[PDB]
């Protein structure tokens, strides 16, 4: 169901690649599949992420770098290796906040 919609979701950019603030000062690219996780373990932790239940319940489109953002940040040393983590986490925030307006701005 909603956790049902976040699969769906997950699973159809699963190996669609995200780019993340790198340990030096450029981006690397990274997707679902590099976590090494099944998806239903994926799902479970993208449950934690502030919103993701709200929009999912509502078909919208998710935020999937966020999502993965933070999972990979959870769960992969080798993500954590490659990524500034605070920059991350503040990246995590931004995407929160662009898809949380988007839910209350004009269309």
Same mark, same amino acid.
């Given at each position: 169901?909603?956790? &049902?919609? /976040?699969?769906?979701? /997950?699973?159809? +950019?699963? +190996?669609?690649?995200?780019?993340?603030? +790198?340990?030096?000062?450029?981006?690397?690219?990274? *997707?679902?599949? $590099?976590?090494?996780? *099944?998806?239903?373990?994926?799902?479970?932790? #993208?449950? =934690? /992420?502030? &919103? /993701?239940?709200?929009? #999912?319940?509502? &078909?919208?489109?998710?935020? @999937?770098?966020?999502?993965? &953002?933070?999972?990979?940040?959870?769960?992969?040393?080798?993500?954590?290796?490659?990524?500034? =983590?605070?920059?991350?986490?503040?990246?995590? $925030?931004?995407?929160? =906040?662009?898809?949380?307006?988007? @839910?209350?701005?004009?269309?």
């Amino acid at each position: 169901d909603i956790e &049902g919609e /976040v699969a769906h979701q /997950v699973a159809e +950019s699963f +190996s669609k690649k995200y780019k993340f603030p +790198s340990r030096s000062s450029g981006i690397f690219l990274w *997707n679902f599949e $590099q976590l090494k996780m *099944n998806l239903d373990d994926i799902v479970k932790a #993208a449950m =934690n /992420v502030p &919103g /993701v239940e709200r929009i #999912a319940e509502k &078909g919208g489109k998710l935020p @999937l770098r966020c999502i993965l &953002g933070f999972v990979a940040l959870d769960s992969s040393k080798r993500f954590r290796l490659l990524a500034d =983590n605070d920059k991350v986490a503040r990246l995590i $925030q931004e995407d929160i =906040n662009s898809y949380m307006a988007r @839910l209350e701005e004009a269309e």
